[PDB]
């Protein structure tokens, strides 16, 4: 389970 990048959840 890789950590998502800082902005992975930004449009």
């Amino acid at each position, epitope marked *: 389970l*890789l*950590e*998502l*990048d*800082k*902005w*992975a959840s*930004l*449009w």
Partner: antibody
Framework: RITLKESGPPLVKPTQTLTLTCSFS??????????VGWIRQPPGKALEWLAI???????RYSPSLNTRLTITKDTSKNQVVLVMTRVSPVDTATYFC????????????????????????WGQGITVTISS | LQLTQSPSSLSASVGDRITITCRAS??????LAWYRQKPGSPPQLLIY???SLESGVPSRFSGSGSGTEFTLTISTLRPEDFATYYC?????????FGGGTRVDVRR
């Protein structure tokens, strides 16, 4: 406009600690979302990502190297520092620092992700050799 | 996750159109960049966000893909293009690079 320069020792002995510095111009680390990262290339080999620090002091490290890596920054001095403990000859490489853009913001709010997805500008590199 | 770059090496001559590709172990949306590295030099950004041309980069470069398959494309090879090329993913930590693709003069 953006320039990055690495500084540090050319030769370090094994078991020692290596401290490297990026000094930059053309951006500020108080810019929103801006990151500075470190990458290394072993001689004759591909690039390996080591660490990143953001303007909010958020930092992330390579899992294989996490234990030995510390990243810190000084916003006023325009400098970022990487510390590696317990060096060994594996760690002989050219070490680069690079700048990562923050998101597009309109009037201080982030509106687009896209610019973030690269390291735009790199330093020239500094070569470090670990030998006893 | 791992980034696999094909081919590892390819031969070309000036004015050639070449295509390098990158496959990811998992979906990384569009968070994929491409770099060119000339021997003795630091990598230089070509394409960010999978398809966006870096300001100041010759139009001959172009990129495509989303999800797991990505392709960099040079339409007209120039001399300064004989170099090594890298992709990077920035969707997950840690930000993986590919293994590289050497591009030499054909003979």
């Amino acid at each position: 406009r953006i320039t990055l320069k690495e500084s540090g020792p050319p030769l370090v002995k094994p078991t020692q600690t290596l401290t490297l510095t990026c000094s930059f111009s053309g951006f500020s680390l108080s810019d929103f979302g801006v990151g500075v990262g470190w990458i290394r290339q072993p001689p004759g080999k591909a690039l390996e990502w080591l660490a990143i620090i953001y303007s909010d002091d958020d930092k992330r490290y390579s899992p294989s190297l996490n234990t030995r890596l510390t990243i810190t920054k000084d916003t006023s001095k325009n400098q970022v520092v990487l510390v590696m403990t317990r060096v060994s000859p594996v760690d002989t490489a050219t070490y680069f620092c690079a700048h990562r853009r923050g998101p597009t913001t309109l009037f201080g709010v982030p509106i687009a992700r896209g610019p973030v997805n690269a390291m735009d500008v790199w330093g020239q590199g500094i070569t470090v050799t670990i030998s006893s | 996750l791992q980034l696999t770059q094909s081919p590892s090496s390819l031969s070309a001559s000036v004015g050639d159109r070449i295509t390098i590709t990158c496959r990811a172990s998992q979906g990384v949306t569009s968070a994929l960049a491409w770099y060119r590295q000339k021997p003795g030099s630091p990598p230089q950004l070509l394409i960010y966000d999978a398809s966006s041309l870096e300001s100041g980069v010759p139009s001959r470069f172009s990129g495509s893909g989303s999800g797991t398959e990505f392709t960099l494309t040079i339409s007209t090879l120039r001399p300064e293009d004989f170099a090594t090329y890298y992709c990077q993913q920035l969707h997950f930590y840690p930000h993986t690079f590919g293994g590289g693709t050497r591009v030499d003069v054909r003979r």
